[PDB]
Amino acid sequence: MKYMVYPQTFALNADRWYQYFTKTVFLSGLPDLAALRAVACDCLLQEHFYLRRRRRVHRYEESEVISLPFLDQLVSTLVGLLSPHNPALAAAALDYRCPVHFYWVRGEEIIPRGHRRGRIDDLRYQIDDKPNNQIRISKQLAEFVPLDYSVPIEIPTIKCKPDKLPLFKRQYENHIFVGSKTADPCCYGHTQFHLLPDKLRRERLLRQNCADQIEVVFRANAIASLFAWTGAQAMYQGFWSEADVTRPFVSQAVITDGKYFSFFCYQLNTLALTTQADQNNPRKNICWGTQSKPLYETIEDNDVKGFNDDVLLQIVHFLLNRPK
Amino acid sequence: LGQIYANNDKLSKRLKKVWKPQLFEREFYSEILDKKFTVTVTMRTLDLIDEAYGLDFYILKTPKEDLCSKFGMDLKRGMLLRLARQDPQLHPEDPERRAAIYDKYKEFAIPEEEAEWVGLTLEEAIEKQRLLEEKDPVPLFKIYVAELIQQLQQQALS
């Protein structure tokens, strides 16, 4: 029996809980110009206006019909355009809705009831994620900060069972998966593109009193996804709980509602999440994050209004970085 | 539905026996109703019709215990109502035929109120009476306004 951890979660203050489970400290902030703008605007206008649809769309279906193909288009074209600049993107493997699985153990528990009452049992967690887009490479991105990096900010602690934040246990095949099998040469990961589900739209949160939880959703989706992704990568190199990683594992994520974009960088320093391994372990995983900013203010008939360049530049920046 | 002895001797085996009538589909015309009906009849009823001098006479003369047909009773009610109402629907724009028909069967004249209940089952009668006596409850506003008006009129007079 393992807890199923959902990157895209309805659970309140899930960022803090995920920080505890993954041993992650969150730090705010990061660690052509005309052709790119044209292409981005083109993709938006194509998915919103230009492309003609036989059946009329609804607001429940708009995320899958409009936003998802937009993100696919953006990723594909921006990989193509920045390929001359970044040779690594040329050799890169691009994945559409490929599963990422991680399974780890973090903490212990004394079974409360039943025939196994009073017996120690490890807490197991499984992340199953379906990122919208994924870029995988044969070489590894360089570390943002050195291993054995010290952060004064401490990892949040929970005073109750994980079950309290709506987390549930189930028993199914344990999977460590990076988006492809181990035989695949593109074992290392570059950038992941996530689209928030329609359930976790901003409008619905505003309709509730979860105005503060907006950014939380984004952060949760980062901490859980990248930790999984990097985790898997680290496990593909033979590193595990007892035999901890020798070099840091880094990855980048772009999380979007379809209008608002948020940017995340993750460094994995520890797979030593078990109690026996965590007994004397100073190292901790790091997540850098940015507040969500709108790519565009609004879309009119055929013209985008209030297009923000800095957001596009930030997408470009993540796509640009290369292995040493 | 009865029993028989096997070879018309009481000493032989007793057996269940059913005697059924012979049935025929025949067409009959009612001049009172000016309609042709296809009905299942026996030879007995055909002979009964012949001796009564027509279907209409047969239906009207014959009481309920002899007819032993729900349809017969409904036909009877139909004809009695036609005769009671002096219904013009029998022969439109032909007064002479209508008058002659009604003159022929003037014997079986009955009040309309009586005619309406002829050949009804108890259940049908219960339903009919319930429908007849069912009215929406009167707003008590109307009752109270009326009684106060009469009271105030009485007060004004004295």
Binding site: Y60 | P139, L140, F141, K142, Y144, V145, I149, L152
Partner: protein
């Protein structure tokens, strides 16, 4: 094989367990892909008044005197609602029969949002 126990949503197999409920009123419908649609109007809306400066409190002072118990009747309601108006009309001026609508009577309930019979409102 427990006849006496109350039949509940806990009791049957998977289909059975999903189908039954605890008597909560529906607030929408299901559609393709087992998607649930909440209809806003179907959800009951609590009409909660402003209680600021409300002098009445949960209990009454014991110093308050006892009164004779008289339930409200139709006759009473009519006497101190409609009777003064119609009597005023009769004594001074003219009272028009079949024009009771001016005195607050309605021939039909169909027009109104709140219908007395049958009831179209909650509590």
């Amino acid at each position: 094989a427990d006849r006496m126990s109350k039949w509940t949503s806990k009791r049957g197999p998977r289909s059975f367990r999903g189908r039954k409920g605890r008597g909560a009123k529906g607030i929408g419908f299901l559609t393709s892909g087992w998607r649930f649609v909440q209809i806003k109007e179907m959800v009951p809306e609590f009409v909660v008044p402003d209680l600021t400066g409300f002098k009445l409190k949960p209990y009454v002072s014991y110093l308050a005197p006892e009164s004779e118990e008289t339930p409200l009747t139709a006759a009473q309601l009519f006497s101190e609602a409609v009777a003064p108006a119609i009597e005023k009309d009769f004594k001074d001026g003219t009272f028009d029969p079949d024009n009771l609508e001016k005195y607050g009577f309605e021939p039909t309930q169909e027009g109104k949002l709140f219908q007395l019979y049958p009831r179209n409102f909650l509590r």
